[PDB]
Write a protein that binds this ligand. Structure first.
Ligand code: C1V
Ligand code: C2Z
Ligand code: C2Z
Lengths: 185, 302, 442
């Protein structure tokens, strides 16, 4: 399983020494400010440190462990989830989640006063499928192919004769049905 | 035998394959008044609508032009008095009089074969079959004999044509030739509506004073009384009720006995008409061939 | 010896830096085969909170199989980085080709645009919108074929949903994108494609200015100079593609119907074309055969790539392909365009939700009061966007609905109703829930 050891810091010569190579200096290839080496390592805890310009150092951004004599060396935990992409993304999403069921309580409008304006109505929703004239030649039940954005949205007629007329376009598998309901108020 | 190839086609294809990419479906609540529902069929351009019972929370039936035909004939008294039951009664109230025979909801699943859909229409003697998804419970499309024959007409080149398709109508004897209920040119609408209720037929050929068939007064021609708001005057002749739509009507369309079954199917599909008048060599009326008789021959019986 | 290697490939010079991560050239240590390796730092993704964006990007590229979209071979995962091993193209950026030649000739410019739109249509059919289409993101190979690459700013297309994010270079962004307004988003790509088409033929941008608000004013205005060397045919196509109103703006079907685009267009780039069904694989049909024959996807392919077309698995695939073609050809049977016999019987105009002239804060209070009366329970995800629920007493199931307030004009406001999908009837449950709130509010 591959493991990446990148040195973001500066320097001319950078060496990698860890428990995986019996604590021996490994020369890193430099591109610009990057000193890297990809090593095949098994799953488990691995301790390592950097040797920059003839002096011992560690990556401050990475987790560290200190010994009895006081030598700092980074510690990497090679997990089974790190080998597969979707397994690693599932773990990465869990760490991302930082600081609500159904209720009958109304929302407070805003911190202080938001003065928040509602989003501008999209022109796509104004394209009513039932208004659109199909023309004489075709069957009256037939309709043009609707835009995906107008699906599931409610369209209604003004209440006349004490009866409310409601319509919405919904998708069966690859087909769209525009149902109309005549329900009295 | 090369026969039963169309029967195998209906068994292989689902009801889903006929539903259009984007279609219009009109549904009525049982508590809605009949008058408003029949005007809604006109405005939306539909011939039938599934009925939704709000209390039961399930589809109960279908509201067709036959309901309007039955309401008119049962409650009409005169042109001087208004048809009270058409003006005030709800669909719920009308069903408690008409269906009291508690008929269950005759429907089909979109995943079910076309053979079952053709069988359900012929067996139950219905012309409108609602397609309801068992997963969601929503009505998707209303299946008809016309839609099935039009879909089959698209795949006729994909499958080898059987021996009966090349054979003549006189050899096969498809359609009704005896007990044909007809109406005269001077007969009133009320009498014509009575024959639709008693004989339970879908169309009535109109005969002239000389004896020749001038037009066809079908069940669909009744919603024009609701469209033109001329429903309370049923004393007027059939010709007087058809003249307003007579321009773009084209009711009478004939087929000869010597003509092959294939040419008859192609004529019904292209003209989009429900039936053809069967005529002899001397252009004399022999019988009537409809979409139901055609699909009963192709799909059912083998 | 000390070479930086990942999956047998030696990492070399940096090709460029995209939306997320760096792209480097990867040479095979044994063969010398070249690949483009996109390195994604796990900590950088966690810091920017784009774990979901990267997840969808990998999922789409693993599914995408188009000759004009950069192919993803594999994705190697390490405890600190993600290595996306992609298809390498020697020619580089389309932007660099335009600058090198000054102006791309009509014969090549048409050929390249047809290849670009073929890739854009594939994305849209798979409910994916690129949102960052520019000649910098359009790459070229040794055989001069166009290839779209950066799917960093890309997003999914959902039913009854809109995308708000503002993405990409201002010179390629649509007027609705720069304004921060909601969009469906297929249209946004067309605008970007319109700018690329102008950049190919003219060698300049139709909307270009040093000052950012002046540049934004030019995009919103939709006024651009059409040079004298461009014919009236391509001029009308560029005008239709570059429309301020997204509704009046051209669609892929409109571009495909255009006479200039039709010229020398190969019959394999777009679906429903003559040589498409016989040369391009249909993903939906293969899965349908795999479940019917109870076999793997590789075996279905082997039967198609075999010498005999009468092979058991191949004939089953083409039966679905043939049946689909017959149904697709009969457009008049499935879709609406002497009068029709059913029209012999036959107006009140329809409107979206409830319209109000009242204050936005006052409209909210009316909705919260109405729900309480009906005993609805809701989730307040946003100030103007709610997720309401109601349990049906007969069926014994919950009915989900989405409420959203919109601004029609300076004095008008609209309340939108949307159904949420996870015996009765789901659609009837939505209408009855809508009818209850409409009656109570008015
Ligand atoms: N962006 C940046 C970036 C990297 O360059 C790498 C690298 C990397 C750095 C340099 C080299 C390299 C070294 C010597 C010669 C050529 C190279 O490409 C190879 C890979 C490994 S993980 C990683 N993560 C990053 O976010
Ligand atoms: O029996 P139905 O399904 O109620 C019915 C209603 C109308 C028709 C009809 C119309 C027409 O021209 O042919 N049949 O059939
Ligand atoms: O009883 P039929 O005359 O044989 C018949 C055939 C086809 C129809 C029909 C009527 C209708 O509204 O949809 N299909 O009715």
């Amino acid at each position: 399983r591959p493991t990446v050891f990148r040195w973001t810091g500066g320097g001319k010569e950078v060496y990698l020494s860890g428990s995986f190579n019996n604590w021996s200096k490994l020369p890193l290839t430099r591109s610009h400010n990057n000193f890297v080496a990809i090593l095949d390592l098994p799953e488990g805890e691995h301790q390592y440190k950097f040797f920059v310009d003839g002096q011992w150092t560690h990556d401050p951004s990475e987790p560290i462990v200190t010994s009895q004599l006081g030598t700092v060396n980074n510690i990497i935990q090679v997990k089974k989830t790190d080998f597969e992409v979707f397994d690693a993304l599932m773990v990465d999403s869990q760490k991302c989640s930082d600081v609500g069921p159904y209720h009958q309580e109304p929302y407070v409008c805003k911190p202080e006063e938001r003065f928040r304006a509602p989003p501008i109505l999209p022109p796509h929703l104004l394209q009513v499928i039932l208004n659109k004239d199909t023309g004489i030649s075709c069957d009256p039940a037939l309709l043009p192919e609707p835009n995906h954005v107008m699906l599931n949205h409610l369209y209604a007629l003004s209440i006349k004769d004490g009866v409310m007329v409601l319509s919405a376009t919904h998708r069966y598998k690859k087909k769209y049905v525009t149902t109309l309901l005549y329900k009295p108020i | 035998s090369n026969n039963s190839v169309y029967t195998s086609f209906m068994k292989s294809h689902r009801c889903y394959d006929l539903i259009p990419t984007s279609s219009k479906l009109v549904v009525f609540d049982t508590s809605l008044q009949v008058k408003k529902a029949f005007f809604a069929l006109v405005t939306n351009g539909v011939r039938a609508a599934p009925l939704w019972d709000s209390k039961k929370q399930s589809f109960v039936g279908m509201l067709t032009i036959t309901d309007f035909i039955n309401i008119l004939h049962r409650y009409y008294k005169s042109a001087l008095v208004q048809i009270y039951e058409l003006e005030e009664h709800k669909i719920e109230t009308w069903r408690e009089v008409y269906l009291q025979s508690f008929k269950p909801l005759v429907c089909i699943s979109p995943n079910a074969s076309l053979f079952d859909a053709v069988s359900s229409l012929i067996r139950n003697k219905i012309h409108r079959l609602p397609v309801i998804d068992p997963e969601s419970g929503n009505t998707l499309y209303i299946l008809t004999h016309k839609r099935i024959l039009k879909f089959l007409k698209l795949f006729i080149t994909e499958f080898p044509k059987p021996e009966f398709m090349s054979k003549s109508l006189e050899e096969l004897q498809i359609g009704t030739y005896a007990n044909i209920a007809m109406v005269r040119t001077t007969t009133p609408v009320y009498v014509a509506l009575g024959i639709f209720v008693q004989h339970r037929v879908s169309a009535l050929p109109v005969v002239d004073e000389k004896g020749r068939v001038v037009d066809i007064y079908s069940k669909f021609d009744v919603i024009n009384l609701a469209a033109e708001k001329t429903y309370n005057n049923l004393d007027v002749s059939v010709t007087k009720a058809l003249q307003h739509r007579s321009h773009y009507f084209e009711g009478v369309l004939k087929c000869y006995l010597h003509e092959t079954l294939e040419t008859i199917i192609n004529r019904l599909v292209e003209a989009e008409v429900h039936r053809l008048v069967v005529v002899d060599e001397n252009d004399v009326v022999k019988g009537i061939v409809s979409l139901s008789d055609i699909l009963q021959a192709l799909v059912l019986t083998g | 010896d000390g070479r930086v290697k990942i999956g047998h490939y030696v990492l070399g010079d940096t090709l460029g830096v995209g939306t997320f991560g760096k792209v480097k050239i990867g040479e095979h240590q044994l063969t010398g085969h070249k690949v483009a390796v996109k390195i994604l730092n796990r900590q950088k993704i966690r810091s920017l909170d784009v774990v979901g964006k990267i997840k969808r990007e990998i999922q789409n590229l693993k599914l995408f199989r188009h000759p004009h979209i950069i192919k993803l071979y594999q994705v190697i995962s390490t405890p600190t980085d993600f290595f996306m091993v992609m298809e390498y193209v020697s020619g580089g950026e389309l932007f660099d080709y335009i600058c090198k030649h000054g102006r791309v000739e009509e014969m090549e410019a048409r050929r390249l645009f047809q290849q670009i739109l073929s890739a854009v249509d594939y994305c849209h059919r798979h409910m994916v919108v690129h949102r960052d289409l520019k000649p910098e993101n359009v790459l070229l190979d040794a055989h001069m074929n166009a290839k779209i690459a950066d799917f960093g700013l890309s997003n999914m297309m959902s039913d009854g949903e809109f995308l708000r994010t503002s993405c990409g270079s201002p010179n390629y962004a649509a007027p609705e994108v720069i304004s921060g307004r909601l969009y469906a988003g297929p249209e946004v790509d067309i605008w970007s494609c319109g700018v690329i088409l102008y950049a190919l033929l003219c060698g300049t941008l139709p909307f270009d200015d040093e000052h950012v608000p002046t540049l934004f004013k030019k995009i919103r205005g939709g006024v651009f100079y059409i040079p004298e060397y461009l014919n009236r045919s391509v001029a009308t196509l560029l005008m239709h593609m570059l429309q301020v109103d997204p509704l009046k703006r051209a669609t892929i079907k409109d571009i495909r119907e255009h006479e200039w685009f039709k010229q020398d267009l190969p019959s394999y780039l777009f679906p429903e074309d003559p040589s498409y069904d016989a040369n391009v694989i249909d993903d939906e049909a293969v899965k349908e055969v795999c479940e019917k024959f109870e076999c793997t996807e590789s075996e279905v392919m082997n039967s198609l790539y075999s010498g005999d077309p009468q092979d058991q698995l191949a004939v089953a695939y083409h039966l679905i392909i043939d049946n689909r073609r017959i149904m697709n050809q009969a457009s008049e049977f499935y879709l609406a365009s002497r009068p029709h016999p059913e029209r012999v019987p036959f107006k009140a105009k329809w409107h979206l939700g409830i319209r109000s002239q009242s204050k936005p804060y006052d409209i909210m209070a009316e909705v919260y009061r109405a729900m309480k009366q009906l005993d609805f329970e809701w989730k307040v995800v946003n100030a103007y966007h709610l997720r309401v629920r109601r349990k049906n007493p007969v069926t014994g199931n919950y009915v989900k609905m989405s409420l959203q307030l919109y601004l029609v004009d300076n004095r008008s406001y609209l309340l939108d109703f949307k159904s949420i999908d996870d015996l009765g009837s789901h659609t009837m449950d939505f209408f009855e829930m809508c009818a209850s709130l409409i009656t109570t509010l008015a």
